[PDB]
């Protein structure tokens, strides 16, 4: 990551486990397969979660950028 | 299956099938995926809306403002 | 029926039909889509506005701001 | 009355007309619409606000911020 | 007041009292000093309003245009 | 006809800043942009006008902001 | 720190610990690694925390910049 290139943290992370925590509390956990400079992102083998807890899992997902607050591998 | 670069693509493949579109404040949308554009807004037919997870009706054709969609699942 | 990268054609298909339009907030009108552009801005003749299968109000001409729609269904 | 591509025509045909404005939240405004500008930023004069079917202020003069806007009618 | 210059009701009403009404229902009253195409602002001898009366007395403010709801002279 | 400049008349002297959802921070004004992100010194944050946190320097986002007052 | 550059604040902070207050009342510790001019931003040994207390370790964080309220450097 260049000081000036957040997004190459996303790079580094991509075919790997990443977490995203969307607004409203709503998370998910899955391998990170894509990515736009929006942010805009698919994961694989995703799990949605609540309180800790799956409740939904999805084989490949979608999220919209806009969502999102934080990404962390 | 998905270029890196382009989570785009995700739609493009699943066209013509069934999806999942998850909408702010628990809403949902399951159809046919038929069109979208870079912004995703997108088109599906023989759709059902549901909200707090019950089915509210079914809609034959329904265009959804990307704007509104948290995520998209095939 | 749709160009699979051109959603907004749904709209097009359907000028001088009716439409619904859900908005955010859940407010929902039903009337003639008249005119609409790329940021989904509409105009709407012969509109009602609904709340429970009940109209709360007609509108004979209405334009309604895209940025506050849900989703339309022709 | 607005070409089937110019949405935001409707509010051309309302000039020095009474206009009714909804805005987000459930208020709504009616006076005779004065100018606009393509982000529906506009001004009426002689505008009154209603809440259930009655005054609740006489306004005057107003500038409305069109990012507020669910609808205009005449 | 021209047809195609909203922004010219702010320029009719500059060194005037007037309401700006606020997302979230907060009122200002004050005197117009300027403002620019954003419809940011500045009042003096500005008065914050809840429910008709004033909450919070300021000398001078600068008022951002993204929060305003109207303007009324 | 540039509201832009009561923040130039301001630097270096102390301000309040209100937030969205009633928050509200008081320091010395130290640079800001076009967009009203700015920087304070010495920012105290206030709740029920009591200080709540001190921080000797704070960077603000712009598109958070109510209003700033001299 | 320029006055017409507050984003030098962040540069003046590259490799230190700051503090990122989010929308909703989120809040970050951890070291500063990057960020770009929509403040999106890399935190490193980053911790989210609650009243004054960690609640959670993470190790790499990139944090969208549309949800900041505040960064204290």
């Known amino acids: 990551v260049n000081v000036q290139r957040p997004l190459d943290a996303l790079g580094n992370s991509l075919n790997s486990p990443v977490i995203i925590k969307l607004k409203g509390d709503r998370e998910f956990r899955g391998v990170l397969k894509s990515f736009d ?14 309180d800790g807890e ?20």
Not at 37 to 50: C, G, I, K, W
Not at 63 to 73: A, K, L, Q
């Open 37 to 50: 400079l929006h942010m805009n992102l698919v994961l694989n083998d995703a799990e949605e979660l609540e």
């Open 54 to 73: 799956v409740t939904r899992r999805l084989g490949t997902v979608l999220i919209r950028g806009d969502n999102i607050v934080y990404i962390s591998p």
